[PDB]
Amino acid sequence: YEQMHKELTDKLEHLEQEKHELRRRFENREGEWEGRVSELETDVKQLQDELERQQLHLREADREKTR
Amino acid sequence: RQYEQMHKELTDKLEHLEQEKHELRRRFENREGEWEGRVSELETDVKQLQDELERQQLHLRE
Amino acid sequence: IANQPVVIDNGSGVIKAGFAGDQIPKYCFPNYVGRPKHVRVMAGALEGDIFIGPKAEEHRGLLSIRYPMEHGIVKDWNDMERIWQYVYSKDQLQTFSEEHPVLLTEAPLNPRKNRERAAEVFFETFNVPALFISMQAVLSLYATGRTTGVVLDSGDGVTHAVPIYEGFAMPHSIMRIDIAGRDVSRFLRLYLRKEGYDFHSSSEFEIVKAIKERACYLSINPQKDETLETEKAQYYLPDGSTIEIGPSRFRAPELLFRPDLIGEESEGIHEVLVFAIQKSDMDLRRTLFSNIVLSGGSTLFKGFGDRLLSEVKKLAPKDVKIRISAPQERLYSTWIGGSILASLDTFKKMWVSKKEYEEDGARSIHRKTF
Amino acid sequence: LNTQEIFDDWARKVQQRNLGVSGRIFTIESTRVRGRTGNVLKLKVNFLPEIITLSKEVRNLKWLGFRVPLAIVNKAHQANQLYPFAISLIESVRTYERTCEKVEERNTISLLVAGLKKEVQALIAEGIALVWESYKL
Amino acid sequence: EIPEISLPIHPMITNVAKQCYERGEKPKVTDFGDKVEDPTFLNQLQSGVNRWIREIQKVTKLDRDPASGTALQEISFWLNLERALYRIQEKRESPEVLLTLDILKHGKRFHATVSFDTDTGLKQALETVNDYNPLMKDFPLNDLLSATELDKIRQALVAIFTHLRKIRNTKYPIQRALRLVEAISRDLSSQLLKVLGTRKLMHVAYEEFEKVMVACFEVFQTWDDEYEKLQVLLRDIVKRKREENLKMVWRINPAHRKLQARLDQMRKFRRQHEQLRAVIVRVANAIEEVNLAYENVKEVDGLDVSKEGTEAWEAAMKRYDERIDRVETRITARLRDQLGTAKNANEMFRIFSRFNALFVRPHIRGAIREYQTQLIQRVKDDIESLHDKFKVQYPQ
C-alpha cells in the first residue's frame, strides 16, 4: 500500500513538474509573441509617421510651388 | 482502510492537477491564438500603411 | 564557501557598507542618484551620465538628484542596481559580487516584493553566493551588546520600535510610522518657504538637509518656546548668502512628536515606543522600560533624548524606571550589528545559499527570513 | 451589387447574439422537449451554427480579408480546438437514436438487446452527468 | 597578439627628470628655467604628443569581426585589449608624460593637450573593456576543446551557457553575443566531428553506434534547451534594452544544424539497413549484396564530410536504396514462387512462419493477399470445427 502511495505521488510529481515546465514554456512563447507584436507596433507607428510627414512635405511642396 | 482512503485522495489530487494542466494548455493555446490575431492585424496594417504611403507619396510628388 | 560577508546597510537616505568583521563602515555615502540637468557642450566635460557617491556630491550643481528608495521601499530598481553596482565598484569595494555572501539590512513591515526582487537582483545580476535579509533593530541591539530591550530607530524614511527579547524580535509589537529624517527635511523646506527663503531645486533640497543637520534642535517645552522670539541665528549657504531661521528650527523637528503638523493621523515617536511596549507581555514592560536604545540618524538632534524622556514619562505608568540609552554610533548601529552578526560561525547556517534559491525560489527566503 | 451591407449584417448578428453562442462548450449534454404525439424529449449537444460561423470567418479572411472582429476570431479559434470532439459526440447520439428507433420498432429483439442497451445507456448516463471535462474528454 | 607601443619622450625632459631623481625632489615645470619659453622646444613637444595620439588611436580604434573567426579569438581579443590599454594608461599616467602635458599647458599649446585628453578613444576603450570584462573573465570554452567524451562536451556546454548567463551585468552587444554563440556552435560541430571521426561510426556494430548516437543527441538536446534559456534571458535584457535598438535579428544557424540532420539520416541508414540485413538471418544469395550496398555507402559515404556529404551522399544513399529495391523484387518474386510452388497449406504456413519479420516491409507485404485469404479460409474452417466439436459437450 505504501508502495502504491509513493507511486501515486511520483505521478503527482510528474504532473507538478511538467505543469511548471508548461507554464514556463507558454510564457516564453508569449514573450516572443510580445516581441514580434511590439516590433510590428513600432513599424506601424513609423509607417503612420512617415505618411504624415511625407504628406506634409507634399503640402509644403503645394504651398511653395503654388507661390 | 486509511491507506486506500489516502489512495483515493492521492488520485483526487492527481485528477485536479490534470484538470488544471489540460485547462492551462487549452487556455494558453487560446492566448496563442490571440497573439496570432494581433500579428495578423499588424501584418495587414503594415501592408495598408505601406501601400497608401507610397501611393500618396509618389502621386503627389508627380 | 566564499571570501567574506559584505554587510551592506541600506537606508533610504544613506547607504553604508563594508566587509564583516570591520570595526566601522569604511564606505558610506548618500542613497541618491544624480544625473545631469544641463547640456553637454564643451568636449572634455564630465563623461558619463549617472553619478553616485563623492563625485555626485562634489558636482552637485549639475545633477538632478533623486532617490530610488523612500520609506524603506524601493521605488526604482534600476537606480538601486546602479547604486549596489557602485558599491562593488573600484571606488568603494574593488571586489566582485561572486565571492562574497551578503548581509542585507532591511526595515520591518515592508512588502514581500522588496525581499523578493532584491533577492533576484543579488542572486541574478550580482550572483552572490549567499544572501541574508534581516531586521535592523536586532542588529542595533547586537551592536550595543545587551540583549533584551526595545530599539527606537528613525532613519531617513522610516521609524519604528521593536521590542526584542533575547534576539526573538517580537513581531506583534513592532509599531511603524513613516515619518523620518527626509520627511522632517521636507517639512523644514515648507517652513523655510514660509520664512521667505525658497529652496525647491532637487539639488537644493540637499541644502535643506544640511540645514536640518546643523541648525535645528528640539525644544523641551514645545509650546513655551513657540511663544517667544528666539535669537534667530544665521546660516551660511554654500553660495555664500545668509539665512536667518528663527522659529523654523525647533518646529521643524517637532514633526516627529506630532505628525499633525504634516496633517496625518499617525503618532509621535513617544507613542510608538509606548505602544510598542504596551502591546507586549505585561511581564516584560519593566525590563523594556529599563532598556531603550536609539539608533538612526534622526536621533541626533539636540535635546532629542531629553525630550523623549519627558514624553515617555508622561506616557509610562508612575514609578517605573525609564532608561534611554544613546550610543555614539547611532549612524553605524545597524552596520556594526551586521559586522558582529555576520562574523559568526552560525552565519553559515543562517544565510540562504544560491543553490537553495535556485531550488525553491523566493519562498525559501520568506521561509528562512529569520 | 454591394456586399458591405452583408458584411455589416454578418458582424452585426454575430455581435448581437452570437457573442454568447461562441464558447458554448461547457454544457456538453442537454436534455430536450419535442412537442409531438406524446411530446418526447431527445438529447442534444450545443454546437449547431457555431461550426458554420467558423467556416464563415475562414472564408472572409482568405477570400477578401477585412478588419474582421478579432474577438470573434479568437472565439472561433476556441470553438475549433474543441469542435471535432463534438462532431463525434453528435454522430454517436444520432446513431444511438437511429438504433433505438430500429429496436423499439421491433419487440422480440428487446429481450436480447436489453443488456447492451443498458450498457449504452450506462455510458450515456456517465456522459450526460458530466459537462465540460477538460481533462478526461 | 595585439602589438604594443612604447610612447617616446623628449630626451631633454628625461635628462632633467633624472637630475631631479639624483636628488630627492619631484620633477616640475619650474625646473626647466628659461627653456619652457623656447618655441622650438615646445614645437618639438607638440609634435611628440601629436605622435602619441596617433599611436594610441592605432590601438583604441581596433576591433575585430564578431561574426567570423573562432570564439576563442574573441575572448583572447578582449583580454589582449585590456592588457594593451592597461599598459597604455600606465605609460600615460607616468610623471614624465604628465610633465610633457604640463609643459604644453604652460606653453598654452592647447591643441596638443585637448587632443591628448579627448581625441584618443582610450578613456572610452578602458570603460568598454571593463564593461565587457566580467563576461570575458574566465570564459570556459577550452573545456569543449579538452575532452573527447560526449558527456564532457555536454558538461562543457552547460558550464559555458551558465557563464554566458553573465550578460545581465555586462551590456555587451546582443548581436555580437549571438554571433559568439554561432562561433561556439562552430566549435561544437568541430569537436563533435573530431570525436566521431575517432569513434569510427560507420565501422562499428549497431550497438556501440547506438550508444554513440544517443550521447550525440544528448549533446544537441542540451544545446537546444540551454540555448533557449539564453534566448529567454536575452529577451529579458532586450526589454530593458529596447530603448536603445531593435536590430536584434535573432536569426541563428548554429553550425551543427546539417551535422544534426546528417546524423539522423545516417541513423536511419544504420537502423534500416541493420534491420533488413538482420532479418535475412532467417534464411536467394543477395545477402552479402545487401551488405555490399551497405558497405558501398560505408566507403563512398566518405567518412561523412558535411558539404560534399550533402552534394554527393544524397546519391550514395539513394544508390544503396536501388540495390535494396532489386533485393526486394528478387525476394518477393522468389517467395511468391516458393509459396505458389508450395503444395500444402501447412507448408505455406511454414513459409509464413519462415518470414515473419519480412512480412513487415510494405513493399514485400503488398502482394500476398490472395494467399492470405486462402489461409484465412483454412483458419476459418478449423475454428468453425472447434465451434462444432466444442458445441458437443464433454459428457457426451
Ligand SMILES: Nc1ncnc2c1ncn2[C@@H]1O[C@H](COP(=O)(O)OP(=O)(O)O)[C@@H](O)[C@H]1O
Ligand atoms: N546631525 C543630524 N541631525 C539630525 N538629523 C540627521 C543628522 N545627521 C543625519 N541626519 C539624518 O538622518 C538620516 C540618517 O539615517 P540613515 O543612516 O539613513 O538611517 P537608515 O540608514 O536606516 O536609513 C539622514 O537622512 C539625515 O537626514
